[PDB]
Amino acid sequence: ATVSMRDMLKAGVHFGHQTRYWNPKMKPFIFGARNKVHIINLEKTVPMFNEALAELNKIASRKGKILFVGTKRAASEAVKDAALSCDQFFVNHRWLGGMLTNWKTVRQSIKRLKDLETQSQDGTFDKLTKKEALMRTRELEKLENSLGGIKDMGGLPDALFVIDADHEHIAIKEANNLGIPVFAIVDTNSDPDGVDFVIPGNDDAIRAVTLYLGAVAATVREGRSQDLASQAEESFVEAE
Amino acid sequence: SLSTEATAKIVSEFGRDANDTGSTEVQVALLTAQINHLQGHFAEHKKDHHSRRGLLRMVSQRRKLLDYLKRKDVARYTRLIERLGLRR
Amino acid sequence: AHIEKQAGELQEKLIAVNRVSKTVKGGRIFSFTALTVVGDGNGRVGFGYGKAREVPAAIQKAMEKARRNMINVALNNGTLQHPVKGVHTGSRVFMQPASEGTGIIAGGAMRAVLEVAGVHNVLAKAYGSTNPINVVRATIDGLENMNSPEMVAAKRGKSVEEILGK
Amino acid sequence: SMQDPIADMLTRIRNGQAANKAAVTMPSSKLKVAIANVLKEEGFIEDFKVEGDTKPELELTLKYFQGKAVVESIQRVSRPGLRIYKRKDELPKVMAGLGIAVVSTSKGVMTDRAARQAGLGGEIICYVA
Amino acid sequence: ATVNQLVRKPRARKVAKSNVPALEACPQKRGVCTRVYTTTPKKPNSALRKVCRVRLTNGFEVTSYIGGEGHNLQEHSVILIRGGRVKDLPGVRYHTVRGALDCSGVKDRKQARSKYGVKRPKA
RNA sequence: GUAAAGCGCACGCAGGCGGUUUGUUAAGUCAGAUGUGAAAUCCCCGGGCUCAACCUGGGAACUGCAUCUGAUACUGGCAAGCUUGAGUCUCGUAGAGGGGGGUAGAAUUCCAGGUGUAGCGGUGAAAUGCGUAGAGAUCUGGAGGAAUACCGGUGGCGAAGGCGGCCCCCUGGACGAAGACUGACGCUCAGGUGCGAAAGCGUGGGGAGCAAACAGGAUUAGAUACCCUGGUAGUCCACGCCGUAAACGAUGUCGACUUGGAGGUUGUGCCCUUGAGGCGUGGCUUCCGGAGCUAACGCGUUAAGUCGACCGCCUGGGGAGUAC
RNA sequence: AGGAUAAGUGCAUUAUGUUUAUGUGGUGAUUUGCCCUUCUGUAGCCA
């Protein structure tokens, strides 16, 4: 178990994120300013994560349909990368609302989506005006890239994995409205209140987004050894 | 302003004669020396109302300490009040 | 597309109706806005404002919004166990304990809102803004200051609330 | 200067929970000690001690059953200058016999239920809500 | 603020249901009519509406509504008035009872018939 | 806060009120005891008249009142503390607080002489204005009074409004720190006395520029608004007479308590003193946002939160901050 | 010779971003304003 906080004494930083005053309610779990700007360190996140690392164990016991949502300029690859497993679905293009609350319409549009995708990729999408077809193709690709998470997955996910807060406000906004428990990675410009499970950290890169949420940890890997007597008998391969 | 040699003379003449500046008689006699000092300024001119707020601070507080004192002992009060003069 | 809460009983309390205007930019369209209250028989925080082209499509929209992001809440007997003064956004309403010997005493759409709320015998005077849109919060704020019975002795009454989690 | 110290006592218990503290410490009247014992036995505080005399001080530990308890709403009703006394006929029933009124009688500080059962009156101190 | 402020410096006191101007501490009262006016309307209207000046017995004078086609009125006749503001006139705070004293009962009403002096449910 | 409504502000007697403990007293307090509180129309239980309305026995709200005995949990009285409130000495520090002194340079303006010729000015654009009696500008030297940048900032000071070149004398009031002392000396404040940004305004000082008025231009249905130009009292200084207002932490007074972070700028411990910084611990003063609050803006540790005592004030508008 | 932090080459109209005349009062869109639930119940109003 201890391996997950053996890695937080090893990464955790961003050296600040935004503003001189930052978000006051995360101040306890985090380091204060130095030389006319704001700096953060990995050191102030380990006393918090000495018990709070037990929540990665509760999203791995019921694991089957997980959704990694909220992409950013350096966080996008990390949303793909922690969700690289085959029980775990992900987007690569920015999320927008109604993808969980008007899920009705979205599932009608998925059902359209995989049909026009087999058509476009076989070559069967031709029109005597090539412009009207190639332009529909570019926009179909953006749908595929945006929806790829819920697209191949059996329905509304059993948790919602928000990596970013800073620009991907909506992914957290809709998770509270569907009542689905939240699995959150918060930065020093975001509060740890109003979400059910946290990693204290930063929102970018592989510093907190798969360093506890992968095979290198022990706490996402002892939750999953508790799935093997509840709904399955063997399922530990699927997941990271 | 108030200086070391006025303050020492006051401790010597009023309250205990060493190591006390805080007691009711001597506290009143230290305030007296600043009221006198303010009346020193008020012997150049009389449109000094922004300082007068302060004069009335030092008096109002003498009224507070004279009240306390006469409720503790009528001797310290009647001596002090006559030995520090003021009014006709 | 959301979870919803239900009651085994029908409420279709239409409280208000309005129309949307832009007046030059596309001129003025026929659209209406509507406010509709969905209780439970013992209460809900259920209040829904929605809008559409026509009055029927508009109310049914608003009736849907009165049962999503909302949960039911519950109170034993046709009275409230606290004399408290519920305020929500300048519409301020009052309650005091009472008998069963009195039922409702109220008018307009308010007598219909209080019946599902369980606070109709305790119904005392409203003050501040008492037009339809905000007067109807009885079953929301007046059930968030709530007290409800669970004791066998009045001198165990504060002890019994402490051990409910200790 | 604060002229009512039992309103101040209660404002410290109130802010105690609002800032989610586990103990709340304060200056301690004879009255205070005497009130804290009723609140302890009717289970609005969990426990307390009183210690020093050269600085006399009350430490109490809060109510919880929800994480943020009904201790955020306890208010003085018979205060300095707004003294109001109730007889054995006029005693305060608070919150349909869920809530307590704390009443200082001539026979000591107790809740309204025990003051009624004795048939005393007295100074009606504070109601819960 | 506190009850102490209110013992030490007492407040004012509102009443309601008594804010329509009225005289001799009573609902109806007699006076001699002094003058008849056709006068110009208040509110955006075009009805040149009809009012009387009345001289009441307690030494004051007030202006009161009249109406109905062909009603009898002269500038010396005794009529009874009842409080009731008229919101289309230059300051009519009373109306006149056609069925009272020197004037007799008239038609040309629907909406108040014990007022202005009328028989039957609508005939 | 802005809807009607925090006194203009400080200081504070009478009255209202009193952190904490011991001693003590028992004015108020509360319990107990006893006496009183007739009658029904009302209220509760009967009863009678063709029910009822009505009237009425027993009980009662009887709407009002008494003193003795006892208690001390509570407030009040009083004596000695306590510090957990406040007050005071030396030490240090910031600032346009107050009163009185000292002092320099440069634009507008003027005179003089030298050099020198036609526009200069004003503005949205403009004309009125000034000028060939030589203007405008420029070199040299004198005249004179308000005024004093940029540093100067969301700073800081004063009682609130209030304070602005720089310096000192006389002196206030605040800000920090250690040694030291007193030990509720406390809180609020009807009445109260005291006290002005500005102009108004008496006399004294003074006048370069600007200006109500008054003229004239420009504008236009005009043109008193809009905009300019001459031009006076005024502005500009000091005290003095009733102190007006947007006279404000817009938020009474003062205080206790409630996650912080950072800005401005400052005592002081610590730093590579590494840039108005960070950390340690106080400071006023401001951004940002959490618990809680608003109708909204907004507030949020300086509250508009949780409250405290005690005082001020409001009860639709207009007409009226006038009348009386 | 300190008018020598040399612009800290950190700097940009540098803090009112302004002015050349106006033209009355009300007026559009419905008579079922009705198509989600047992019991505790509802829109003229019901299981």
UniProtKB/Swiss-Prot annotation, chain B:
**Record has rRNA-binding as a keyword:** yes
Coiled-coil positions: none
Looking at the keywords, is Ribosomal protein present?
A: yes
Q: Which UniProt keywords apply?
A: Ribonucleoprotein, Ribosomal protein, RNA-binding, rRNA-binding
What Pfam families does UniProt report for this protein, alphabetically? Answer: Ribosomal_S15 (PF00312)
Q: Which family does the record assign?
A: Belongs to the universal ribosomal protein uS15 family.
The record describes its quaternary structure and partners as:
Part of the 30S ribosomal subunit. Forms a bridge to the 50S subunit in the 70S ribosome, contacting the 23S rRNA.
User: What HAMAP family does the record tag this protein with?
Assistant: Ribosomal_uS15_B
Report the protein name in the record: Small ribosomal subunit protein uS15
Which organism is the protein's source? Answer: Escherichia coli O157:H7
Curated annotation (Swiss-Prot), chain C:
Q: Which residues carry this modification: N-acetylalanine?
A: A1
Outcome of mutating R111S = In strain: NEA-319; neamycin resistant
| Biological process terms in GO annotation | cytoplasmic translation; maintenance of translational fidelity; response to antibiotic; ribosomal small subunit assembly; translation
Domain of life, per lineage: Bacteria
> Got any disulfides in this one, which pairs?
none
GO cellular component term of the entry, any: cytoplasm
Supply the alphabetized keyword list: Acetylation, Antibiotic resistance, Ribonucleoprotein, Ribosomal protein, RNA-binding, rRNA-binding
Q: Name one Pfam family in it.
A: Ribosomal_S5_C
| UniProt-recorded Gene Ontology molecular function terms | rRNA binding; structural constituent of ribosome
- The residue ranges of the S5 DRBM domain are 10-73
Q: What HAMAP family does the entry give?
A: Ribosomal_uS5_B
Its annotated function is as follows: With uS4 and uS12 plays an important role in translational accuracy. Many suppressors of streptomycin-dependent mutants of protein uS12 are found in this protein, some but not all of which decrease translational accuracy (ram, ribosomal ambiguity mutations). Located at the back of the 30S subunit body where it stabilizes the conformation of the head with respect to the body.
- Family from the record: Belongs to the universal ribosomal protein uS5 family.
Question: Could you describe the subunit structure of this protein?
Answer: Part of the 30S ribosomal subunit. Contacts proteins uS4 and uS8. With proteins uS4 and uS5 encircles the mRNA as it enters the ribosome, which may play a role in mRNA helicase processivity. Can be cross-linked to mRNA. In collided ribosomes contacts ribosome rescue factor SmrB.
The misc remark on file is: Altered uS5 proteins have been identified in a number of mutants. Some mutations in uS5 have been shown to increase translational error frequencies.
Name of the gene this protein is made from: rpsE
From Swiss-Prot, chain D:
Keywords of the record, alphabetical order, are: Repressor, Ribonucleoprotein, Ribosomal protein, RNA-binding, rRNA-binding, Translation regulation
What the entry lists under Gene3D superfamilies is as follows: 3.30.1370.30, 3.30.1490.10
Is Iron-sulfur given among the entry's keywords? no
GO terms assigned for molecular function: rRNA binding; structural constituent of ribosome
Any single GO CC term annotated in Swiss-Prot or TrEMBL for this entry: cytoplasm
A Pfam family in this protein? Ribosomal_S8
Q: What PROSITE patterns does the database record attribute to this sequence?
A: RIBOSOMAL_S8
Tell me, which GO biological process terms does this entry list?
cytoplasmic translation; regulation of mRNA stability; regulation of translation; ribosomal small subunit assembly
Subunit comment: Part of the 30S ribosomal subunit. Contacts proteins S5 and S12.
The entry's family comment says: Belongs to the universal ribosomal protein uS8 family.
Which PANTHER family does the protein's record reference?
Answer: 40S RIBOSOMAL PROTEIN S15A
So what does this one do?
Answer: One of the primary rRNA binding proteins, it binds directly to 16S rRNA central domain where it helps coordinate assembly of the platform of the 30S subunit.
| Protein name (record) | Small ribosomal subunit protein uS8
Q: Which organism is it from?
A: Escherichia coli (strain K12)
The gene from which this protein is expressed is: rpsH
From Swiss-Prot, chain E:
Q: Which InterPro entries match?
A: NA-bd_OB-fold (IPR012340), Ribosomal_uS12 (IPR006032), Ribosomal_uS12_bac (IPR005679)
Keyword terms: Acetylation, Antibiotic resistance, Methylation, Ribonucleoprotein, Ribosomal protein, RNA-binding, rRNA-binding, tRNA-binding
Keyword match Ribosomal protein: yes
Q: Which residues carry this modification: 3-methylthioaspartic acid?
A: D88
Q: Which residues carry this modification: N6-acetyllysine?
A: K107
Pfam families of this UniProt entry? Ribosom_S12_S23
Phosphoprotein in keyword set: no
The transmembrane residues are none
What PROSITE patterns does UniProt report for this protein, alphabetically? RIBOSOMAL_S12
Q: Which GO terms describe its molecular function?
A: misfolded RNA binding; rRNA binding; structural constituent of ribosome; tRNA binding
Q: Which Gene3D superfamilies match?
A: Nucleic acid-binding proteins (2.40.50.140)
What's any one GO cellular component for it?
cytosol
Single GO BP term: positive regulation of RNA splicing
Q: Give the NCBIfam families listed for this entry.
A: rpsL_bact
Function, in words: With S4 and S5 plays an important role in translational accuracy. Interacts with and stabilizes bases of the 16S rRNA that are involved in tRNA selection in the A site and with the mRNA backbone. Located at the interface of the 30S and 50S subunits, it traverses the body of the 30S subunit contacting proteins on the other side and probably holding the rRNA structure together. The combined cluster of proteins S8, S12 and S17 appears to hold together the shoulder and platform of the 30S subunit.
Could you give the subunit structure recorded for this chain?
Part of the 30S ribosomal subunit. Contacts proteins S8 and S17. Interacts with ArfA. May interact with IF1 in the 30S initiation complex.
Q: Which family does it belong to?
A: Belongs to the universal ribosomal protein uS12 family.
What is the name of this protein? Small ribosomal subunit protein uS12
Organism name? Escherichia coli (strain K12)
